[PDB]
Amino acid sequence: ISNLSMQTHAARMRTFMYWPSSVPVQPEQLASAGFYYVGRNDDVKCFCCDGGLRCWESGDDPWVEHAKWFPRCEFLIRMKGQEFVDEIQGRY
Ligand SMILES: CN[C@@H](C)C(=O)N[C@H](C(=O)N1C[C@H]2CCCN2C[C@H]1C(=O)N[C@@H]1CCCc2ccccc21)C1CCCCC1
């Protein structure tokens, strides 16, 4: 999938068709946080920073996971703010 083709929410949403129903995080929450489905298991990537996340757990918040593992993402920073990211990185 072309990263440029995934710049808008609606485009990201349509990538989730065969997304496993057993995974306790929903496409809407993933797509909102910049993620699209790469078509394997529960693997997703961010359209902006190309960071990959998998093995979603109950209670996971995709924005928090985005900040935990890919804190330099500019989409993340513009949406949630550097302060949010700093705190998730343990900078208070
Ligand atoms: C519990 N919440 C989940 C979202 C989580 O934290 N997942 C971790 C993760 O996705 N990570 C871990 C971090 C550590 C440093 C960078 N990693 C990014 C990410 C990951 O494992 N990404 C893989 C490897 C790189 C290629 C790729 C491509 C698509 C999707 C995932 C990944 C990890 C996945 C394997 C089981 C343990 C938890």
Ligand SMILES: [Zn+2]
């Ligand atoms: Zn990102």
